[PDB]
TrEMBL record, chain A:
InterPro entries: ACP-like_sf, PP-bd_ACP, Ppantetheine_attach_site. The keyword rRNA-binding does not apply. Residues 1-77 form the Carrier domain. The gene is hitD. It comes from the Bacteria. This is Putative ACP. Signal peptide: none annotated. It comes from Embleya scabrispora. Keywords: Phosphopantetheine, Phosphoprotein.
Automatic annotation (TrEMBL), chain B:
Gene3D superfamilies: 3.30.300.30, N-terminal domain of ligase-like. ADP binds at T280, G281, D283, N303, G304, T308, D399. Keywords: Calcium, Metal-binding, Nucleotide-binding. Ca(2+) binds at D65, L386. The keyword Calcium applies. SUPFAM superfamilies: Acetyl-CoA synthetase-like. GO terms for biological process: amino acid activation for nonribosomal peptide biosynthetic process; secondary metabolite biosynthetic process. One of its GO terms (molecular function) is nucleotide binding. GO terms for cellular component: cytoplasm. This is Putative ATP-dependent b-aminoacyl-ACP synthetase. Residues 19-371 form the AMP-dependent synthetase/ligase domain. It comes from the Bacteria.
């Protein structure tokens, strides 16, 4: 994933230390990503990438981890 | 041999299934299948499902007053189960699949239910062996661990029997069939909902707002449109779900609107079928409300005010339009059959327009008390300070309000530190006490910091992710951030 993506995701996971690696498999819910937070992260990604998440892509599985969300973003751009 | 409520006794079964006799083939539920096709379940079909689940529950030999934990989303099967429990006088305790294990065990340890029931595909495991376990679904009700054998002592079910118990320490708000039916007969008198309405409900089943919505839709003969979290949490899915199901009323804490207003106001304005909105639990910010009103000009918006211990109290329709100068919305007037006294610190009526006093409520929908906590009950359900000798009680609410020139009420905060997070009561002192017991932490402060406000913990000490888990306390009570600080500044 590119430097923009890490920076945006880091915004919505307050329990992730500045000094700590964003692990691709980290459960974002466990790092403070909540219901509202998730929609803000979607909106930030759509805005920064000009990406559109189709209805089917808007689900908890795609937003559970940075690796799942990066692949979903990547699929939307394609 | 199982006791069953008689048709003339206040009971959720008879009240919520009256439409099964008077209008059997009207819809009670609107859902959308895996293929995005909209389905309806009639009052007739729902009653059939309730009666089948009741026949199966009655085989387990539970006595009236025996507690049943129902772990589910707001689904036709879950509502059939709670109505089956209602018929047999088995108080149900609603819990959500997303309820933390620590929190579910605290409810089991406090309530000591005879039975835990979850959906066929529920993933709850390790329920202690002293509680029966069953699964409900298309296949009926299947036992895994039958509840322990007992003698049935209760001959007849009565209106004062417990319909449900809503749950640091889990507080069980004990609610009688009489109380819940009385709340709905009061609301029915206002003509606020018609049998032609399709009420979208948004709060998960463990919250008192879910039960309110269920009883409001079914007791009116209206259609319930449960909004699953897989639609609710995604504004474009939420809005397509409301359109597809043809929702005419949308109920939820103000928070349900904030993502939609911020990110999809254009699609929101397309909900041509929505004729009303109801919000409760917390303040709705006036700019956001004015925005919502502007987007849906053909919608009535109702501010409902109430606590779990009476379920509801008052409402107003929000003025059309909301004046520019308006500092605070009215919570309006009590429902017919309800009465509010505003008392000073000496229990004396506050008679002057615009001076705040503590809300004391007289209600036909009063909770019976807090489960196994008569001291908490005595603090809240008190001798009527205007009529102490009759034995009559009032709800001492902890809320302040003042009256306007027309006598309308205005919420003026509380007598304690209680705040609302997504309409959920929170005692910041409780989150503070808990973080103070995390090994490493000497001082702690929890506050709402301003989009919707977030619970922030400031601590003197460290793994903020581990301290989070140690909290993960209920869900809404878990800090959005835990910031280590050198000193708590006064
Ligand atoms: N419309 C409202 N506006 C402002 N505060 C409200 C409103 N409705 C409820 N509250 C607050 O919420 C408290 C009750 O919270 P709770 O018992 O969870 O039930 P509910 O939020 O459904 O009323 C009240 O004591 C009051 O502080
Ligand atoms: C007694 C009673 O019901 N009082 C109102 C309590 N609050 C609610 O009904 C709010 C319902 N809660 C929610 O909808 C959740 O808080 C979210 C908003 C579903 C949680 O989102 P994400 O934050 O997991």
């Amino acid at each position: 994933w590119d430097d923009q993506f890490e920076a945006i995701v880091r915004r919505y996971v307050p329990f992730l230390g500045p000094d700590e690696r964003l692990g691709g498999g980290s459960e974002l819910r466990d790092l403070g990503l909540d219901s509202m937070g998730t929609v803000e992260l979607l909106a930030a990604l759509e805005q920064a990438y000009g990406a559109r998440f189709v209805d089917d892509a808007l689900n908890m599985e795609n937003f559970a981890t940075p690796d799942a969300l990066w692949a979903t973003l990547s699929r939307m751009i394609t | 041999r199982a006791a069953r409520a008689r048709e003339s006794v206040d009971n959720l079964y008879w009240f919520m299934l009256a439409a099964a006799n008077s209008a059997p083939d009207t819809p009670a539920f609107v859902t959308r299948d895996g293929e995005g096709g909209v389905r309806t379940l009639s009052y007739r079909e729902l009653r059939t499902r309730v009666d089948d689940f009741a026949a199966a529950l009655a085989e387990l030999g539970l006595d009236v007053d025996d507690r049943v934990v129902l772990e589910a989303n707001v689904t036709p099967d879950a509502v059939a189960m709670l109505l089956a429990c209602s018929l047999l006088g088995l108080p149900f305790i609603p819990v959500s699949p997303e309820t933390p294990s620590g929190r579910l065990r605290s409810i089991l340890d406090t309530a000591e239910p005879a039975l835990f029931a979850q959906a066929e595909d529920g993933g709850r495991a390790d329920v202690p062996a002293t509680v029966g376990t069953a699964r409900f679904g298309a296949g009926g009700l299947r036992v895994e661990r039958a509840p322990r054998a007992r003698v049935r002592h209760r001959r007849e079910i009565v209106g004062t029997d417990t319909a449900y118990i809503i749950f640091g320490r889990p507080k069980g708000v004990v609610m009688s069939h009489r109380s819940v039916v009385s709340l709905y007969r009061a609301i029915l008198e206002q003509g606020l909902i018609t049998p032609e309405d399709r009420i979208a409900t948004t709060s998960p089943l463990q919250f008192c707002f879910a039960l309110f919505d269920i009883g409001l839709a079914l007791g009116t003969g209206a259609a319930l449109v449960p909004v699953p979290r897989e639609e609710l949490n995604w504004p474009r899915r939420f809005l397509a779900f409301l359109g597809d199901t043809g929702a005419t009323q949308v109920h939820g804490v103000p928070s349900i609107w904030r993502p939609v207003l911020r990110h999809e106001p254009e699609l929101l304005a397309g909900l041509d079928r929505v004729r009303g909105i109801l919000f409760t639990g917390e303040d709705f910010p006036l700019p956001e409300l004015r925005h919502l009103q502007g987007l849906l000009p053909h919608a009535r918006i109702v501010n409902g005010y109430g606590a779990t211990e009476s379920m509801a109290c008052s409402f107003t329709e929000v003025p059309r339009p909301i004046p520019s100068d308006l500092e605070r919305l009215s919570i309006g007037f009590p429902l017919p059959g309800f009465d509010v006294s505003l008392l000073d610190e000496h229990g004396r009526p506050v008679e002057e327009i615009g001076v705040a006093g503590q809300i004391h409520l007289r209600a036909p929908s009063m909770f019976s008390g807090y489960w196994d906590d008569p001291e908490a009950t005595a603090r809240v359900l008190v001798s009527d300070p205007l009529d102490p000798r009759s034995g009559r009680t009032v709800l001492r609410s902890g809320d302040l309000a003042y009256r306007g020139e027309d006598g309308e009420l205005y919420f003026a905060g509380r007598v304690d530190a209680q705040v609302q997070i997504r309409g959920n009561r929170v005692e910041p002192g409780e989150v503070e006490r808990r973080l103070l017991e995390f090994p490493g932490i000497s001082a702690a402060v929890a506050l709402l910091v301003p989009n919707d406000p977030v619970l922030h913990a400031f601590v003197v000490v460290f793994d903020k992710a581990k301290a989070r888990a140690f909290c993960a306390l209920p869900g809404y009570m878990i800090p959005a951030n835990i910031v280590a600080v050198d000193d708590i500044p006064l």
